[PDB]
């Protein structure tokens, strides 16, 4: 097994309520150890481990570097968010909903974007939660998600099972039914 030395630099922006609240954190990472970061909430570089101490000290001592980092939340984060508003944040892809038995009923909700979604199982007129487990969101990697939501059931005569799906790409819920 050959040895590898890894370095990572991440320029991260955290957005809440549009650009009302924006937090910038740039992280310098040796192998998997974050060693220095600039957090706009703090307003200077802070070493995270001893390895990053001379970097932080050196970077903080340059007033111009500091002033540029402090302005990065507006120059970089708020600026790019304006591009996201016209593109990524408008992307809408409508989920497909399918019910299949594996007893155990599986509702597959596939090919949607964005991530915000709510899947519910009903037996007759009532929501089932006790016997329901959902996968976490599964990222397809091509800007769509899917999710599997499973229902443990003991089907009696006349039972009607409904998988109910709410998502920002739909004006109304999608409903698919299944009977034993």
């Amino acid at each position: 097994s050959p040895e590898d030395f890894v370095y990572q630099f991440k320029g991260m922006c955290y957005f809440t309520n549009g650009t009302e609240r924006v937090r910038l954190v740039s992280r310098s990472i040796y192998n998997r150890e974050e060693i220095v970061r600039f957090d706009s909430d703090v307003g200077e570089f802070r070493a995270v481990t001893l390895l990053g101490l001379p970097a932080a000290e050196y970077w903080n001592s340059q007033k111009d570097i500091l002033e540029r980092k402090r302005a990065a939340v507006d120059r970089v984060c708020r600026h790019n968010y304006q591009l996201e508003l016209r593109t990524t944040l408008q992307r809408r892809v409508e989920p497909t909903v399918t019910i299949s038995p594996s007893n155990l009923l599986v509702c597959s909700v596939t090919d949607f974007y964005p991530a915000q979604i709510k899947v519910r199982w009903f037996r007759n007129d009532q929501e089932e939660t006790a016997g329901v487990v959902s996968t976490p969101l599964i990222r397809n990697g091509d800007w769509t998600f899917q999710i599997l939501v499973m229902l443990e059931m003991t089907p009696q005569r006349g039972d009607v099972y409904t998988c109910h799906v709410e998502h920002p790409s739909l004006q109304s819920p999608i409903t698919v039914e299944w009977r034993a």
Binding site: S1, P2, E3, D4, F5, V6, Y7, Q8, F9, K10, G11, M12, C13, Y14, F15, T16, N17, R23, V25, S28, I29, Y30, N31, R32, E33, E34, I35, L51, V76, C77, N80, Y81, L83, E84, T87, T88, L89, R91, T96, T98, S100, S108, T110, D111, P114, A115, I138, R139, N140, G141, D142, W143, T144, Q146
Partner: protein, 180 residues
């Protein structure tokens, strides 16, 4: 950190093995573009984004800085090399399988560290490369990575596949099987 949206502008990676680098931007965990460092060319990963311009030179400049930092840190860390993690491999279809309807097999290789990996596809025991593609290494908050490989196919009873994963954290190439 809690936020409605998270972006990396960008994820900068450089490692001694190769050596090799990678420059990407991510928005909400998906890859916006990557810069092909060897060709000095920005490659958009979402069609709507092709209307934008990102000068590859900006990424070359950042990766050059990382290369300089990595070499400073190797010595100061007393040559502390990357720890080989065990990646986790999952294989699934993009949409529900109906025979004779085109689909995509997805092989998710998660918890990758260091970011060196060989992901291949076997169709009935023999390697195939047509219809195969993959994401870049996508970042995670614990500073490991994940990568997704794809295989376009037509599901049929007579065909099964394996995702073959090679990584130093594994005793032997891990084989994940899939059938319709």
């Amino acid at each position: 950190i809690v936020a409605d949206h998270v972006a990396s502008y960008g994820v900068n990676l450089y490692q001694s093995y190769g050596p090799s680098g990678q420059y990407t931007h991510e928005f909400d965990g998906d890859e916006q573009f990557y810069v092909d460092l060897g060709r000095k060319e920005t490659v958009w990963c979402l069609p709507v984004l092709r209307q934008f311009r990102f000068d590859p030179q900006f990424a070359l400049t950042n990766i050059a800085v990382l290369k300089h930092n990595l070499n400073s840190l190797i010595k100061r860390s007393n040559s502390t090399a990357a720890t080989n993690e065990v990646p986790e491999v999952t294989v699934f279809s993009k949409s529900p399988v109906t025979l004779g309807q085109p689909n995509i097999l997805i092989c998710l290789v998660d918890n990758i560290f260091p970011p060196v990996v060989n992901i291949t596809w076997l169709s009935n025991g023999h390697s195939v490369t047509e219809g195969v593609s993959e994401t870049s290494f996508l970042s995670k908050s614990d500073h490991s990575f994940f990568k997704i490989s794809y295989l376009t196919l037509l599901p049929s009873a007579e065909e099964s596949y394996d995702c073959k994963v090679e990584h130093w954290g594994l005793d032997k190439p891990l084989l994940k099987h899939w059938e319709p």
